[PDB]
Amino acid sequence: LPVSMTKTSVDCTMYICGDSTECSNLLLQYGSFCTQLKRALTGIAVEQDKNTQEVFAQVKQIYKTPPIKYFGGFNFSQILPDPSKPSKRSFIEDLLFNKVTLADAGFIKQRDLICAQKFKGLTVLPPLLTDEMIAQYTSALLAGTITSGWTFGAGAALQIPFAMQMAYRFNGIGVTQNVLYENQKLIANQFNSAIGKIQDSLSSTASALGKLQDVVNHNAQALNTLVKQLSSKFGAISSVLNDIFSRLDPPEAEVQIDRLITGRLQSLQTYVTQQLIRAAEIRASANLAATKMSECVLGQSKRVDFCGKGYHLMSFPQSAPHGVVFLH
Amino acid sequence: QKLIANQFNSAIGKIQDSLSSTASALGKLQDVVNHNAQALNTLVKQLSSKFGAISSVLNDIFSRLDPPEAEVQIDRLITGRLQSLQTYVTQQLIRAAEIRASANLAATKMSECVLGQSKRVDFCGKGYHLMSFPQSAPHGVVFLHVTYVPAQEKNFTTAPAICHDGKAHFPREGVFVSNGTHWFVTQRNFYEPQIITTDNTFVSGNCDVVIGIVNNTVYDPLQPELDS
Amino acid sequence: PTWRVYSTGSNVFQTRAGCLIGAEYVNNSYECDIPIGAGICASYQTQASQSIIAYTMSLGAENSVAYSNNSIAIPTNFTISVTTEI
Ligand SMILES: *[C@@H]1O[C@H](CO)[C@@H](O[C@@H]2O[C@H](CO)[C@@H](O)[C@H](O)[C@H]2NC(C)=O)[C@H](O)[C@H]1NC(C)=O
Ligand SMILES: *[C@@H]1O[C@H](CO)[C@@H](O[C@@H]2O[C@H](CO)[C@@H](O)[C@H](O)[C@H]2NC(C)=O)[C@H](O)[C@H]1NC(C)=O
Ligand SMILES: *[C@@H]1O[C@H](CO)[C@@H](O)[C@H](O)[C@H]1NC(C)=O
Ligand SMILES: *[C@@H]1O[C@H](CO)[C@@H](O)[C@H](O)[C@H]1NC(C)=O
Ligand SMILES: *[C@@H]1O[C@H](CO)[C@@H](O)[C@H](O)[C@H]1NC(C)=O
């Protein structure tokens, strides 16, 4: 499920004009068009941080895992963070990160890439939460729900063995406790066989993370449409302002360099309009993902087809680029 | 009863203290009025714009230039005054979607926490939900979520089963706890130790398949009533 | 020589969101007061004089749960709490 969106800032003067022309004196006759768009863009830029704070910051206490990792025969080595890595991610998280090809332009570094849209006034702001911090929020959420169950989401963290925790979770769907206490090895082997198939079904088929690629590529498409509309005329003689200024006669330029200005204002308004439209979908997806975390990870839900297909027992979230992955 | 009533009264009396302080508690209701005022202020502040024409006053242009040369500046002002209003209507229809998505969530929370009790965690407040009280607010609603928060936990020794006579005993609605010497049964969310009784536990299988089974005596509530 | 008219500077810092000028970076960690970007937040704290400081945001409290295979935690009391929701 997607969670966040690429925060984009737009330099209005560098997009409409070319930062080397007397166009900036003609843009002041409109006044408040370059401020409303950047205000609406700052609203999206703080909304995509609020959407991450509403999903991943559900607990205010970072829980840790014990050094001896015995949980009644269950193996969580593929979902726990690997300490022999600089990113300190899980064995599923490093495969989820390597399958989402990001194309953002938020950096400091300087044949050119697709991030040449910075030179036209279209920059990318970095998110507030680093991916290492998201991977540690994920680690705290796993260390709470493994060593405590659902007690860390309602009050203080109460310790419980994982065999008794799953025996408690069998009672939520109508199954008695004697099924696990007579068949613990079969449940442990089925869980360790179903966990290892997740990395096999994720590294294959090449289209598992389509919902994250569909929100990564759409921002780049909306940016490349905004840049490719700059090389247009809107019914004038040329697209380069430095040719119309250095060729035509001053009082007949207030129509040919008015058509380009109105066209570039309409393109910016269109870009802000479709981004404000598609941000309500990412906000709805984040409001659904936070409810899914609270009802499947922080507790046990009895809702059908809300925490997977079947009778829900527990869930495990994994950190994803611009989203989250649930292991139901 | 008196402790729960005093805790509820002390938690209700702190709501008015937490609401009258910090000066920014009702931000979600102030931001809607701030946006609806900023849009209405921007719609008037763009009437003083010329959009590349001679002047922003219409009666100057209709009494200044030619009966058919003023119709290219008036048509320039009209195609910006109909664009600002279209942008205002588009942004209002965008904000109306978020307002409707918040109102549907508010109605769902009202029906699922005020009109009843919900088992959805963190939907009717943080903790085990008990009650919820609505309050009339300007352009919104305020829910006072009464929740159950456990506190003052203690450490005990647990066991999956109790072996009395070669049979495995499992708790019906409780859990086997130990205070160091004896073994008791209590509920999961509150410490209330009771004796191991055949009415509190049920029998299923032997003591050879259950891992971690311990040895204790399961008290029969019939055998003292048979010797006497 | 710049479109910006003035120029200010007290202390420079290399943040991933850009060059932060006017805040001193400390090795401590607190709650995020003013978000800057990429795990860096700014606040107004004293240390006597008051100044704008830069820091990495606090993830929360660290609490290692004493988990074992033969221990349970049962609460003995409770607390009735009322939480507002606007
Ligand atoms: C949990 O599962 C992982 C694999 O999913 C196990 O790691 C394997 O350990 C064997 C040792 O016999 C190695 O040969 C494999 O290469 C390991 N696999 C990977 C992917 O690293 C691990 O032993 C299991 N148990 C625990 C307690 O972690
Ligand atoms: C564990 O609990 C049992 C019973 O709840 C305690 O046994 C009681 O101890 C007190 C004082 O030590 C005596 O006055 C009672 O007569 C005992 N009752 C029974 C039924 O034996 C026991 O002391 C507790 N142990 C610990 C370490 O707290
Ligand atoms: C800034 O410049 C210095 C030297 O020019 C360089 O070493 C450093 O890597 C640059 N910063 C970034 C974030 O690349
Ligand atoms: C419990 O008692 C049975 C029979 O007295 C014995 O076989 C078993 O080993 C005992 N278990 C433990 C843990 O002492
Ligand atoms: C139970 O836990 C102890 C310490 O926590 C450990 O030494 C022991 O090996 C565990 N039992 C099993 C069967 O692994």
Residue numbers in the entry:
A (entry chain B): 724 to 833, 844 to 1061
B (entry chain A): 917 to 1144
C (entry chain A): 628 to 674, 685 to 723
Reproduce, without paraphrasing, sentences from the article in which this PDB structure was first reported.
pmcThe Omicron variant of SARS-CoV-2, the causative virus of COVID-19, was initially reported from South Africa in November 2021, and quickly became the dominant strain worldwide. Compared to the original wildtype (WT) strain of SARS-CoV-2, Omicron has 60 amino acid mutations, of which 37 mutations are in the spike protein, the target of most COVID-19 vaccines and therapeutic antibodies. 15 mutations are in the RBD, which contains the ACE2 binding site as well as the epitopes for 90% of antibodies induced by infection or vaccination. We report the structures of the Omicron spike trimer on its own or in complex with ACE2 or an anti-Omicron antibody.
We further solved the structures of the Omicron spike trimer in the apo state, or bound to ACE2 or an anti-Omicron antibody. In the ACE2 binding site, compensating mutations strengthen RBD binding to ACE2. Both the RBD and the apo form of the Omicron spike trimer are thermodynamically unstable. Our data reveal that the Omicron RBD is less stable and more dynamic than the WT RBD, and the Omicron spike trimer has 6-9 fold increased affinity for binding to ACE2.
